[PDB]
Amino acid sequence: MEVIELNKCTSGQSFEVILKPPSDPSLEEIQKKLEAAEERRKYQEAELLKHLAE
Amino acid sequence: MRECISIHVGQAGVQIGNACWELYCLEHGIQPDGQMPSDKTIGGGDDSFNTFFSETGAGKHVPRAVFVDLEPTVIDEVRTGTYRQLFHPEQLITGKEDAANNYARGHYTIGKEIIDLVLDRIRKLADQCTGLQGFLVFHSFGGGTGSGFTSLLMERLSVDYGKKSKLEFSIYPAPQVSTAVVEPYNSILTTHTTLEHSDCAFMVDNEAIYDICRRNLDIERPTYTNLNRLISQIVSSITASLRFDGALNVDLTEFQTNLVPYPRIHFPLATYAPVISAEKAYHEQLSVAEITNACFEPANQMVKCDPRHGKYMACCLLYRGDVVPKDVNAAIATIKTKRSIQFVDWCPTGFKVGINYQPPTVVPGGDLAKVQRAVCMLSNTTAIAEAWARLDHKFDLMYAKRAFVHWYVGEGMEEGEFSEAREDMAALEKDYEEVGV
Amino acid sequence: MREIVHIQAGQCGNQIGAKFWEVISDEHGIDPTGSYHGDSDLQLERINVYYNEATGNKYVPRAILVDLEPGTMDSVRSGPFGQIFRPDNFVFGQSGAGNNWAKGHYTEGAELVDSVLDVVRKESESCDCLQGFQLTHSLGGGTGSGMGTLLISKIREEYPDRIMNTFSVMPSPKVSDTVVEPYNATLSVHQLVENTDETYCIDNEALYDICFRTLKLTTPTYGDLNHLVSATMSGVTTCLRFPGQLNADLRKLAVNMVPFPRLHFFMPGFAPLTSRGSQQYRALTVPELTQQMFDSKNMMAACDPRHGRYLTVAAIFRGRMSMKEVDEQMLNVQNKNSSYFVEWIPNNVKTAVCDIPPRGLKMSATFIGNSTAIQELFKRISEQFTAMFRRKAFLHWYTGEGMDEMEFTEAESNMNDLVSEYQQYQDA
Amino acid sequence: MYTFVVRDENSSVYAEVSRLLLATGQWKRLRKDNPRFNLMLGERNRLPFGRLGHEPGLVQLVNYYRGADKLCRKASLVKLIKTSPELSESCTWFPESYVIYPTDEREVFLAAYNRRREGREGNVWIALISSEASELLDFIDEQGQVHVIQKYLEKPLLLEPGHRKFDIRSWVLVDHLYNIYLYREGVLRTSSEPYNSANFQDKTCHLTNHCIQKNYGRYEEGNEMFFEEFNQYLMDALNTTLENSILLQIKHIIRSCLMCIEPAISTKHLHYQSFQLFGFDFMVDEELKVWLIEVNGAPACAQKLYAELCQGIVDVAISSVFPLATSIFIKLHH
């Protein structure tokens, strides 16, 4: 019902119609997490190479 | 003028990126070689299109875009394709081996090796910016790179660019055009890691787009090219207010202000009309009322769900073509009486409307017919949680048996991250619940 | 990653391996000299996966030919496409394995293995991004079974982050050389469970049954059996060899097909089943292809799929056809027989279509099933093993090479565990 | 072959429906959590509507309308009738009703209760039954649930012989096309003890449920008078038919309720489809005026009628979507 904020230019126009009123981790934390995953990877491959050496 | 940088991650992001930048060029009259004759200020300036394009002394208009993929297949097609001159080689980053549909491999294993190169090539574009406002991030939920690497990049961008806004264009997985059986796993994993780092995210369900192409474009079995041309139209509609003169959604901060009152609930639904076949011999052109009415039909949404059984927090209508405010208001008053449109109590029942007089541009020889008028509605409705419910249930089915988990653990991810990611999703489904019913 | 290093060990390994290279060379338009005499560029786009480009438009199979006996490798070198192989990739011993896994794995093969690994390394170094290894071998003899598994173990030590794929021919009393085959197979299966990512179970029982019961051939030869192996092998490698919708590779196959690491033994299938020479003139429709490729009569492992459940399925259709009709027929099988697909892996069937059909067929379909019914194959071998082992019969052939009974008990134990592991998910 | 899932074990209507479907030999029943179904016979509460219609190569149908609970809970039914312009406050066929909360419209209720006292006319209300307002408000706060207070029908139609009260149950099937089908057989759920004008604690003569009664079975079997007998009684006693005196009003009420909610619940353009069987409960006053009492979203049938109705549900609601190789319904045209 109520039209507000009407702005017009050569390209077009914009407006608001209201019908009814109302009632992060650090760099250190990322680099530590990514390196912790590599330590889990290193350990699993080392366990495989130990198994194969057996 | 304040610049935006577009980031395209993995296969889906890159291919959609191509579709969008093809369209942006056709919209601004920028040639495949980068020349733009209508631009009278050679080699710089602060026009509205400079938000997405920088300029060289020779007059080349170059995208503020970085393409990143862990294998070279897809980006090589950018490197050699019809828009090759547009990007400089530094904007196109590839590895040798992909993430094999594995979030943990994209995030932790291959992610660690390529992240610093990507952030450096991002910093290259950010240095050419007088007033960088933030980032537009294109990726799939389902891919290993699209999910895994994106979430890592998004974390780092918060650290390196704290003041900047981050927006997502995300492809939600559909069995109709799927790559991996573990797509639900990757989706929940990426959403959980990305949630604190995304300000506003536009989800596109591949199922919805597929069926739109089948029903409205008469395409028997839609290709990625078919889907991407359609997506690019929707993306272009969303970003038009950044690239043209106007007073609505003119900066990225305004997307959060206008669409996201609740920061966690940052997934607005996009609905688009009309989608018309170029092969249709006879076409009766559709009015402002007819196209605006179409914005409330499930068949036209980017995500199939039922807004009648949810609540609204915000609503934008973005028109392109022959549209005047008088006709918009006449259309709205009629629709409000005929349709179930329930806003939340702590929000006004209202619509923010933007009109651009230029009708949508279609790619020559595409599937979309030229139209006199078009509209993209952006509504933040709790009904979109239907998609989270669907996705979480598929996750639950697999994870009950710990199926495929070893592939993730094998890349050095702890199994606890699965249940952490899932609990966050359960918390999100509850957030929507409180607001919605 | 795209390059695959192919290894073929022992008699069966080399005989099926040679047939694989004959078939895929014809598909890619390569002649015995190695010169491309094709026409479609699609033949060349992913040719570097199996072929190394040589001096002057010549294509050299990335193939290593291994035996403890000079016999079979002379027959390859003198065979149809024999000239195509790189001469230095012929790695052979002299004394043979005598159908003895212990000779292959511990004594004779241990003497020759380092030489093979030097050739593997030379081929690995030529690779821009090596994705992994495929091995052809039987499990019933000594060289393919014993030395093949030794090789796999050593390759995994040297390349622990690469994929190991095998085509593993399972022994049957229906087509048998020696009584000791169940021993060799059981010792081998033990190695495959631990050291491969993907194994195509090629059952000689099934191949005999298809030849006899279905293909009308009253006395099947090895040649008749190997006609089925090459049609299957061509089909399972299609998406690696041709441009596709998915950009298929060995690692993605593993991630997507294998929900639990030990359960990586695939039941392959082919439609239509044909015998040599006699070409059938009527082409199969898509409903016919889909029906046959799921039927037990078309499985390359002698297991009834109705006795278990599909964990995952991959299917590759070849020829000019309605891709929509392919979707509809494949969805029809799943929606009408949903009890035979685990409900706890959603959307567990993936399908591709390739434009290029195999030689002599307008329409074909290759099945790759990870079914729990594969336990039937391992139980069959395990029963044959036990009937001998409970009397320690024929054991002296192995104890004479320094093997102990303890190693036999462990191999048997691990294969029985595998069986119960399959059963666990057949009821869940 | 078609497929279905059964997700409500306690439902007798859909026990018989699933049994009839199996008997065709063209319907196979699947496990509770099997997503690859054509038909869902769903759970009463928390039905996962959002998971429906997302299965490639399957047309999916469910035996419940999402949003229909607004008609089928007392609290929401009043709010719907009070707020919908198609129904409204001056709605002649629904008794005066007020939403009451315990820790809302209590001040709206008591102000209208005064008009009933200052006019000195009949002032009996139902939540249990009392003639004084604050008598059962002390029982509302005691319960701790949102129950509505409604004007009690003090002058009801009474069957002879017996001077008894009753209610009419109507079975209504709404298909996927939003056709409204009234089952031609309804049931009168009779009282067996005579209606007492000034003794409201005597619940057996005032509340006419099948459970409360079970003089039970004296006048008719299981306190159930069907349509043939009631029509004959109306012809004998009052010189009128069931059709003219009562059924016209019933058909009007059913059409009015379901028309009102039609835009909110319709599955006409949805990715999945709905049908639903409803039980409407009617009261008749002494001047043959029909009043709506409530709507049942999960109704149970009468024993005699189970077979005929359940076949009808299979006929027009199930086989209309999924075809195979007289009508018991009256189509309420709109």
Ligand SMILES: Nc1nc2c(ncn2[C@@H]2O[C@H](COP(=O)(O)OP(=O)(O)OP(=O)(O)O)[C@@H](O)[C@H]2O)c(=O)[nH]1
């Ligand atoms: N709409 C659309 N979806 C795509 C496209 N390419 C891939 N997808 C979807 O993205 C998901 C698979 O992820 P991809 O983006 O292909 O994988 P990726 O990010 O390259 O990661 P990798 O697994 O390392 O290759 C699936 O849901 C596909 O349906 C595209 O061009 N358009």
Ligand SMILES: Nc1ncnc2c1ncn2[C@@H]1O[C@H](COP(=O)(O)OP(=O)(O)CP(=O)(O)O)[C@@H](O)[C@H]1O
């Ligand atoms: N306003 C009113 N005036 C007269 N009688 C009323 C009334 N409200 C309720 N009743 C009587 O009380 C009985 C039960 O009322 P109601 O229909 O609310 O309970 P209920 O939900 O258990 C029946 P159902 O089993 O069909 O769901 C009815 O059979 C009716 O006779």
Ligand SMILES: Nc1nc2c(ncn2[C@@H]2O[C@H](COP(=O)(O)OP(=O)(O)O)[C@@H](O)[C@H]2O)c(=O)[nH]1
């Ligand atoms: N399908 C098939 N099976 C074979 C072939 N040659 C041998 N076999 C089987 O392999 C087993 C014998 O192993 P073989 O490969 O001859 O021994 P190796 O030379 O020591 O590897 C038996 O089960 C045979 O049936 C062949 O060409 N085709």
Ligand SMILES: COc1ccc(/C=C/C(=O)c2ccc(OC)c3c2OC(C)(C)C=C3)cc1O
């Ligand atoms: C259950 O869902 C899936 C199952 C398997 C895949 C496989 C993806 C591949 O990359 C791949 C790799 C090798 C292949 O040949 C053996 C194939 C292969 O997949 C296709 C192209 C579909 C067919 C064969 C993906 C899934 O989602």
Ligand SMILES: [Ca+2]
């Ligand atoms: Ca300029």
Ligand SMILES: [Mg+2]
């Ligand atoms: Mg990729």
Ligand SMILES: [Mg+2]
């Ligand atoms: Mg032999």
